[PDB]
Design a binder for these strands. Structure first.
Ligand code: MG
Ligand code: MG
Ligand code: MG
Ligand code: MG
Ligand code: MG
Lengths: 83, 208, 99, 150, 138, 125
RNA sequence: GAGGCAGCAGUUAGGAAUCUUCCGCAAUGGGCGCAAGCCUGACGGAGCGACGCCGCUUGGAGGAAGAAGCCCUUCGGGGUGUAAACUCCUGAACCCGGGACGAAACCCCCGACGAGGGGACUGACGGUACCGGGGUAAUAGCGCCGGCCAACUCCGUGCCAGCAGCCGCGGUAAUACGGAGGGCGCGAGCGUUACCCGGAUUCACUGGGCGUAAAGGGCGUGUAGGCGGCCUGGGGCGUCCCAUGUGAAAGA
RNA sequence: UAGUA
RNA sequence: AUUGAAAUC
């Protein structure tokens, strides 16, 4: 099963995630198939969240379950919002 | 941490009065008035034709000793300036001149770089409102380097801000005297400072 | 694309199979000079149709044997017993290279 | 007048009947730091006349250094004996990067931006001489226009 | 047998010019003719012209020198200071437009054979091609 | 050589060898002393120069040099070795490190105290 | 019969040398479950090492034709030295008060188990970071001073004791040894040993050479191989040019 | 014979 | 003792 999900970058007490698609069986910070956004949980920047949403829809379309928190953030930038 | 020990004492040795002791190194002695020579048992002894190394060394000591900064810190700054776009010696003087602990002193909030450092560590100085206590901080252009509202009262801030009532300020800086705050307008050009030091010998000192 | 190599047949002393010498030339990684280098490939010949001195194209294939992995695609030209001879001496030269 | 620097002084020795007998060799450059340098190697019983003597010779021995903003027109290599000097143009900010010998000739000519390598035998005399020939031999667009014109 | 004609020529010119001769025969080829035009066009020589010598084609070459000169040794400066094979039969040198040499910050040639034909470096650069880097003159 | 030759033979890389088998590179090695002779040097020198033969944890048995003024070393002493030639003593390619194991520091040593291995004193200090 | 830490800790042994039998599943990720949840030494943190990189403290401004002591002294003087003393100033440490972001989902309620809306639970780090109040002049060491290489004088010692990267110092006047004073260089570091690239165009493609310096085979014949005159034509393998694909992220 | 110009 | 020594009384 392939996943949209969060990879930890940044540093210590400086979490920074990259919203990535990957094979579920890979380690967390290992090789991903595609970057599709990033996220700063401390919102220390005006732009602490961003998502290429045409691409998110793509993968969802070919079956890729997001983590639960991957999907929260996906929502905030309305990946799932219609009409 | 930084130098600490006898000083207007290379207001000797480097041969030229360095401004290190501030108000005294201005007034019959940066001892350079009373003793214009190298320290120790051999100070006034017959000079020796010195090496194109000894020359290059001295010069970089001189510059480094003016601003009070360490060799570790100095050497990096320089390295940074070689890899940087533009004629390298000036740039370095530029970056050297953009250090808080020295802009504070250029604005006369203190009389000495040594004294001006202590004001930065000890809190009494701000950068656009926010308080800043790193003497190494890179003031960029457009910043406002103020006194601490809670520190205006102090005898030393007043006495010093006072002697600046008349005084002029650097071309790349300004200074609202009664609002106890000033401004880094731009980074200076080699032309703007009159430093007792040929910068190209410094470049050359670090090319071996 | 399945690689197509062209060389010469230097052996048909094998059933449904031919040894095909293939040369190649290039700049030398450090010293500039264009050097030659060459390789025999065992190529499949189901109709024992090609023979000594044929210049033939050769193609990447689904493995026929241990070390057959190419098939004779077409004839380019017949004759070329010079190249064959050229080979064959280099081989017989090795005889007085021993101890 | 010019500014004049001593590269090198050495003591030599001939052997005579009971006892050795010294002598002093002096390499000196003079320059106005605007594309006129000269080299002199003068020798004598005592150092100062060697130095003074060197000075004199160096002014008899001057060169066209066609500067181009603290640097030089192009690259030259020169072999003088088994001494090779290579000279390369540099941008401002670079400096005079060479060993004592060619630095002091290049500085006093009025160069501030050059790249060099001392190659082969690095004997100062012969290196110095090579650098000069190297300078003596630089050209500019003007000179080659003139030459190739006819 | 004569292993490199182009080099022989490049050398006949080196040799003659160094005893300040006025002219030099070289046995004639088309590729030899070509290099000579670029040479002539950039004013390193005065020029060339075919001839026959003992039934057989040579290209006479008219060299060119500076003015007679001042002090001890009044020999002219030399218009061709440096001429030098690069590609050679024992080691061919080929370069693409991106790697074409700039002889002597500008003041120098690099004759250079391409599919657009024999060309100087700037010619070739502007035409955007590379090739067998024949030689260099300065 | 001709290029063809260079293509046939290549250039050969230069491989200079260790000046010091304290084996496994190892910046130091452990010894047990064996003999503590006194050695006369050479060339234009004379003095009675202090030495040890040392059985190594390398399996090596080698002559090393005791630097400093006086020492406390004998047939079973047990030392650290750092390597460092002497020069006056042919075949003496290593040094004993003063201040580790049963090798003493150096008493009343005031200047190069870090080498010689001697802690800071307490006179007017 | 049982067993297999090259999982995390940790024990031992070899070794110049390499850590806590730590807190937490709160975050991210993984597995099973419809879910609540259960498991995860993956992980997120804390602990120990100046092992590396960066930041910062050991004070700031006054302060004598210049104290004492210690070093030199042609006995007049010179040095340590504005350095201390001492005068005002600031206030690392430390005490008090307040005190985080990292966490909004899953889940429940409205809606339709969707979209969208609402709601609640949850912090190992931690009572830490950061803010405010109070407030003490409060750490300096290591290497070096014959040349290369920045820095010199007095004693001691006499081819001794010892130094030494290389050249080389020491035989009663030693800037080279050992101590002193002083000086130079770095500074919470400074030295040393080992290993790598460098300088070394000293394996030389860039970029070397062979009469006498290391180096022409004792001479031929010729095998393979390398190399190949002038002109024209075909092919387009070498070579050149344009598009396009690839060249993961991290790094630079 | 040793060190030493 | 002799030159700093080795040798030698
Ligand atoms: Mg020492
Ligand atoms: Mg090399
Ligand atoms: Mg012979
Ligand atoms: Mg033959
Ligand atoms: Mg001796």
């Amino acid at each position: 099963m392939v996943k949209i999900r969060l990879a930890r970058f940044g540093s210590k007490h400086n979490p920074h995630y990259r919203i990535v698609v990957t094979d579920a069986r890979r380690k967390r910070d290992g090789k991903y198939i595609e970057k599709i956004g990033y996220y700063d949980p401390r919102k220390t920047t005006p732009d602490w969240l961003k998502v290429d949403v045409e691409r998110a829809r793509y993968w969802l379309s070919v079956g890729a379950q997001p983590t639960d928190t991957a999907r929260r953030l996906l929502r905030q930038a309305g990946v799932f919002r219609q009409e | 941490g930084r130098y600490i020990g006898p000083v207007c004492r290379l207001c000797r040795r480097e041969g030229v009065k360095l401004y290190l002791k501030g108000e005294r190194c201005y007034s019959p002695k940066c001892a350079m008035e009373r003793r214009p020579y190298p320290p120790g048992q051999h100070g006034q002894k017959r000079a020796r034709r010195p090496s194109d190394y000894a020359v290059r060394l001295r010069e970089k000591q001189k510059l480094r000793r003016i601003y009070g900064i360490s060799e570790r810190q100095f050497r990096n700054l320089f390295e940074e300036a070689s890899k940087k776009k533009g004629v390298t010696g000036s740039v370095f003087l530029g970056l050297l001149e953009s250090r808080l602990d020295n802009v504070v002193y250029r604005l006369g909030f203190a009389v000495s770089r040594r004294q001006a450092r202590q004001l930065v560590r000890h809190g009494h100085i701000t950068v656009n409102g926010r308080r800043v206590d790193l003497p190494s901080y890179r003031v960029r252009p457009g910043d406002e380097i103020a006194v601490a509202e809670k520190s205006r009262n102090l005898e030393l801030i007043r006495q010093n801000l006072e002697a600046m009532k008349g005084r002029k300020v650097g071309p790349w800086l300004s200074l609202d005297v009664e609002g106890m705050k000033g401004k880094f307008l731009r980074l200076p050009d080699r032309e703007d400072l009159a430093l007792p030091v040929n910068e190209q010998l410094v470049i050359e000192f670090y090319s071996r | 694309p399945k690689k197509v190599l062209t060389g010469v047949v230097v052996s048909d002393k094998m059933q449904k199979t031919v040894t095909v010498l293939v040369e190649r030339q290039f700049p030398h990684p450090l010293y500039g000079k264009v050097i030659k280098r060459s390789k025999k490939y065992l190529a499949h010949d189901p109709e024992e149709k090609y023979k000594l001195g044929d210049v033939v194209e050769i193609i990447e294939s689904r493995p026929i044997s241990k070390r057959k992995r190419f098939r004779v695609l077409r004839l380019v030209e017949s004759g070329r017993m010079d190249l064959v001879e050229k080979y064959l001496i280099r081989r017989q030269n090795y005889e007085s290279l021993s101890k | 007048d010019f500014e004049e620097k001593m590269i090198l002084i050495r003591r030599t020795a001939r052997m005579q009947a009971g006892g050795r007998r010294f002598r002093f060799g002096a390499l000196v450059v003079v320059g106005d730091r605007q594309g006129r340098v000269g080299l002199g190697f003068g020798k004598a019983p005592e150092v100062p006349l060697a130095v003074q003597k060197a000075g004199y010779y160096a002014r008899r021995n001057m060169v066209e250094v066609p500067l181009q903003n603290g640097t030089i027109p192009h690259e030259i290599e020169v072999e003088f004996g088994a001494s090779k000097i290579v000279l390369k143009p540099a941008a401002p900010g670079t400096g005079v990067i060479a060993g004592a010998v060619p630095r002091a000739i290049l500085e006093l000519a009025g160069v501030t931006d050059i790249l060099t390598k001392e190659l082969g035998s690095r004997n100062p005399i012969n290196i110095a001489y090579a650098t000069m020939e190297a300078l003596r031999q630089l050209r500019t667009k003007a000179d080659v226009e003139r030459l190739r014109k006819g | 047998m004569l292993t490199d004609p182009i080099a022989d020529m490049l050398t006949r010119i080196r040799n003659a010019t160094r005893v300040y001769k006025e002219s030099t025969d070289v046995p004639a080829s088309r590729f030899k003719e070509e290099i000579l035009r670029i040479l002539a066009r950039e004013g390193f020589i005065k020029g060339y012209e075919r001839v026959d010598v003992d039934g057989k084609p040579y290209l006479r070459v008219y060299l060119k020198y500076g003015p007679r000169r001042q002090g001890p040794d009044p020999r002219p400066e030399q218009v061709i200071h440096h001429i030098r094979r690069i590609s050679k039969p024992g080691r061919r040198v080929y370069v693409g437009v991106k790697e074409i040499p700039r002889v002597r910050r500008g003041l120098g040639i690099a004759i250079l054979s391409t599919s657009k034909g024999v060309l100087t470096d700037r010619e070739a650069r502007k035409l955007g091609v590379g090739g067998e880097l024949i030689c260099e003159v300065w | 050589p001709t290029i063809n030759q260079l293509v046939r033979k290549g250039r050969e890389k230069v491989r200079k060898k260790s000046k010091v088998p304290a084996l496994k590179g190892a910046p130091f090695r452990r010894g047990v002393c064996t003999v503590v002779r006194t050695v006369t040097p050479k060339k234009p020198n004379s003095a009675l120069r202090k030495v040890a033969k040392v059985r190594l944890t390398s399996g090596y048995e080698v002559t090393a040099y005791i630097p400093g003024e006086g020492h406390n070393l004998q047939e079973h002493s047990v030392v650290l070795i750092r390597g460092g030639r002497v020069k006056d003593l042919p075949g003496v390619r290593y040094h004993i490190v003063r201040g580790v194991y049963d090798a003493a520091g150096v008493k009343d040593r005031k200047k190069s105290r870090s080498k010689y291995g001697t802690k800071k004193p307490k006179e007017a200090a």
